[PDB]
Amino acid sequence: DIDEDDESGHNIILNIISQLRPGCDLTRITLPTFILEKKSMLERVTNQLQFPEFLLQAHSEKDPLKRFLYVMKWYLAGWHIAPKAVKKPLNPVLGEYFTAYWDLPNKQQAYYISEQTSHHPPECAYFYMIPESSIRVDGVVIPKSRFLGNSSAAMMDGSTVLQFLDIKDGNGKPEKYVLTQPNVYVRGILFGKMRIELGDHMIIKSPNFQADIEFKTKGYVFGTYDAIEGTVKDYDGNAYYEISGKWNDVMYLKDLKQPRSSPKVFLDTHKESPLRPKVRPLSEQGEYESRKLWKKVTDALAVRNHPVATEEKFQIEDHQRQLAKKRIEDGVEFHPKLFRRSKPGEDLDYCIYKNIPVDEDPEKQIRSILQIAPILPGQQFTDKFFIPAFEKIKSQKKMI
């Protein structure tokens, strides 16, 4: 039964590992389908966006340090929404895209648009906005796979930029937060049992505050799994708060100006109610839209038919290898449909192609967002959807 399946899975992974040297990447290694969850990475990102109420709280908070704490709460809250066993999202194909929306309790909507912008090396970009609350998020996920011996990792080199568009600094520009991502490990692959862990550092930086949060691994005897430890500081070396606890249990905040005080509950992940994204029905989705593209694989995963899931996934990835060969033959390269290459020196590799002026009427911002790609039920693709973003911005100003 399951014990015999576990032994064969063990054998399959050992035979892959036996040929590798610690320190190498895994870009050329195909992993088996029985470590896959039923969503692509483009959708997995939205797990981290399932607690918008904390972001709405931050936006309404006038004190910069308190506002920073709510942003940290928003960002830390999503990590525990993750598969239970040892599973990873599907690696998206080049040009795959995924859109979603939320119906928020305040009668507003949040919108999400994402695209896989590169395959070698893998990269996806995402855009998230709540126009009627003047909240905008732009980000990139850049996973660099690594074999380390008894462990493997996705070294997470992406980042997220959050802006409160109507909270202006001295320069009149929106208040900006940059947030990085901890690395995702699987440990115990050689002499143990596989377990997923977060590790290394998460950095959160605002105009006047910063936090460095270390995601720790357990010791042999001391410590616990899934522990976090960090400090909220200004940029002059003053420490204001200490964060502690576990990112998938209870996180605590200690006021460092009150030495005798004890850490208070900051985030109890077992008492939070996530808000899940909504998506257009499958009948309206495009060929390379995430849920539609992977539907045959995820259907086979859902019935535990791993021969079929493996064959369906190979067909998709083989087709992509053929498309890449055709690009070389035509002497062209891929360019994303929905994201334009950022200017040099900026935090992000890609940004959504559409110009959305920071202070225009949020109804006009919503209309611009909905023109980018079908998000809401009933919206249809236009012919222009499929042309590259760089060709779309050329016309977005050629008419001007």
Binding site: K107, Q108, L338, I366, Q371, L376, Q379, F385, K392
Partner: peptide
């Protein structure tokens, strides 16, 4: 340049009452 067609009315918190009941259900 638009990649998608627009709803006949752009949805906002301000026209929510046109799209939902006073009991909160769709119409």
């Amino acid at each position: 340049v638009a990649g998608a067609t627009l709803p006949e009315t752009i949805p906002t918190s301000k026209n929510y009452y046109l799209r939902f009941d006073e009991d909160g259900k769709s119409i």
